[PDB]
């Protein structure tokens, strides 16, 4: 593989679409990787991750805990729910809920949890709380995923994301158990961890969450790093590109490929 900066550039180039990339050393913020990173790309999924951030928020400041548990009817089930859909009758706690919406991407656990935030308006607040002022949450599950040309709504910049990643799980703002907590729900992501870690040569740890949208979005913010470390952040947005999800995930693990041949800079 070419270096890192220059895949990105092939990604581009091969997709007809937009690359966002930032790697970022986790315990320091030190970048080492900065493409577009300044630039608006749709949250998707990724979103999951700062929601149950502001959610532990919460939880350190005594206004909710994990064990609550929250019962639901099936009118609230949006598309894709396959973890919610199976405790209509019995209910799931909010730790549960997290757990559903960043390990298995289920999106009614996710609006659920959105609500006890203050629905979009109040996870942007949170945002804005811990200094990011870029990132915005304007729309519920589905609908956040529409990556309309031009439109701000639902947005993060590879650059804010990676900082509030940071953040959440290193700046003592969440409590350590909290950050604790976030990030093994990371480590425990069943919709890509698995199929990444088949993928990844042995010694390389993996955290991650990812997310797709319309006109080609797609994305991921990951921890990652040799002697099963998770010693960087790296964060990926793609969008507008009309590439088949196989070519947009190949060019992603290609991106993937160049960091680890050149992990040393
Ligand atoms: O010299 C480095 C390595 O070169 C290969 O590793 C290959 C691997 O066989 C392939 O499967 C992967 O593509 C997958 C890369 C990871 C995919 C997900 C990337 C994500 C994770 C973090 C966020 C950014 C994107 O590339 C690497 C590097 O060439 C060798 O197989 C391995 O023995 C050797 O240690």
Redesign the pocket.
């Known amino acids: 593989?070419p270096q890192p900066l220059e895949q990105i550039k092939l990604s581009e180039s091969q997709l007809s679409g937009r690359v966002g990339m930032i790697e970022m050393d986790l315990a320091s913020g030190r970048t080492l990787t900065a493409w577009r990173a300044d630039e608006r790309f749709p949250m998707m999924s990724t979103f999951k991750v700062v929601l149950c951030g502001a959610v532990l928020a919460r939880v350190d400041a005594g206004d909710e805990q994990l064990e609550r548990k929250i019962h639901y009817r099936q009118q609230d089930l949006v598309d894709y729910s396959p973890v919610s859909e199976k405790h209509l009758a019995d209910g799931m706690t909010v730790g549960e809920l997290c757990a559903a919406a960043i390990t298995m991407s289920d999106n009614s656990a996710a609006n659920l949890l959105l609500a006890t935030v203050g629905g979009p308006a109040g996870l942007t607040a949170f945002l804005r709380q811990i200094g990011d002022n870029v990132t915005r949450l304007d729309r519920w599950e589905t609908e956040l995923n529409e990556a309309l040309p031009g439109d701000a709504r639902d947005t993060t910049t590879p650059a804010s994301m990676a900082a509030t990643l940071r953040k959440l799980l290193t700046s003592q703002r969440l409590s350590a158990r909290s950050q604790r907590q976030l990030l093994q729900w990371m480590v425990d992501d069943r919709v890509a961890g698995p199929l990444?870690r088949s993928?990844?040569?042995?010694?390389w740890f993996?955290a991650?969450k990812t997310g797709a949208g319309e006109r080609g979005a797609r994305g991921?913010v990951?921890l990652?790093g040799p002697n099963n470390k998770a010693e960087r952040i790296?964060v990926?947005y793609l969008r507008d590109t009309p590439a088949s999800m196989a070519e947009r995930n190949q060019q992603?693990?290609?991106?993937?490929?160049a960091?680890?041949?050149h992990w040393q800079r």
């Open positions: 593989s990444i993928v990844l040569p042995a010694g993996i991650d991921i990951a990652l790296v990926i992603i693990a290609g991106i993937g490929a960091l680890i041949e």
